[model samples]
Target: RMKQLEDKVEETLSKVYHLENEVARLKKLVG
Candidate 1:
């Protein structure tokens, strides 16, 4: 149960990193 919780947090952090990259791309595309 603890391991599953850790896995979910890890995935959430990773996806947030990808979101940051996505916003960086948007900034370049516009400004």
Candidate 2:
């Protein structure tokens, strides 16, 4: 389903942002 793809994308990119020390970017997103 489209939702499954969306969920994976959200989780994968979130981890990448955190590990890459782009917390500001992720914080803005989560904010």
Candidate 3:
């Protein structure tokens, strides 16, 4: 159970990191 929870947390953190990078790229593309 603890391992499953850790996996989920890691997945969510990865999603956030990708999202931040994507947003930064888009901002630079337009500005």
Candidate 4:
């Protein structure tokens, strides 16, 4: 169903957003 697909998209977005933030933080750490 469309609703199920929407939920999956939301879950994937959450993980992608979390990973983006993590990578940004790591880039800022200088050692």
Off by over 4 Å in 2: 22-31
Per-residue CA lDDT of model 2 for 1-31, tens digit only, reads 9999999999999999777787776887896
Error of 2 at 27 (Å): 20
C-alpha TM-score for every candidate: 0.84, 0.59, 0.80, 0.81
RMSD of each: 0.7, 8.1, 0.8, 1.5
Model 3: CA > 4 A from native: none
RMSD of 2: 8.1
Better of 1 and 4 by TM-score: 1
* Global Cα lDDT for candidate 1: 0.99
Q: Please, what are the lDDT tens digits per residue for candidate 4 over residues 1-31? A: 9999999999999999999999999989955
lDDT of 3 by residue, 1-31 (tens): 9999999999999999999999999999998
- Score residue 16 of candidate 2 by CA lDDT: 93
Clash pairs, candidate 4, are: none
Range of the 10 consecutive residues with the lowest summed lDDT in candidate 1: 22-31
Candidate 4's TM-score: 0.81
The C-alpha local distance difference test score for the whole of candidate 3 amounts to 1.00
Instruction: Kindly give the stretch of ten consecutive residues in candidate 4 with the minimal lDDT sum.
Output: 22-31
Shift of residue 6 alpha carbon in model 1, Å? 0.2
